[PDB]
Amino acid sequence: KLQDSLDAGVGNLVDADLAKESAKLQSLQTKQQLGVQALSIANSSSSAILSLF
Amino acid sequence: KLQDSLDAGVGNLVDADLAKESAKLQSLQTKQQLGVQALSIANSSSSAILSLF
DSSP, rough: OHHHHHHHHHHHHHOOOOOHHHHHHHHHHHHHHHHHHHHHHHHHHGGGGGGGO | HHHHHHHHHHHHHOOOOOOHHHHHHHHHHHHHHHHHHEEEEEEGGGHHHHHHH
């Protein structure tokens, strides 16, 4: 019984809550795609100077 | 485990950060179009002498 309670306590300390991690995974992937699009916009923004001459 | 760690370290030493490279590609290409236009404006400048005489 003592070894069982000790394993359960170590698990309470280290083990992760996978549901919260799945939520942050989805939000972060969507944020990454938005960041790639924002980077493409930032590259495209320079082009307007080209036509001025 | 040691093989994987050594490979990851060499990869840190040599791998490129591609997103900054795409941004450099865009800014550089725009710089070439503007520079070609500047070279054309430069070639234009000598024309006025034919009118002056």
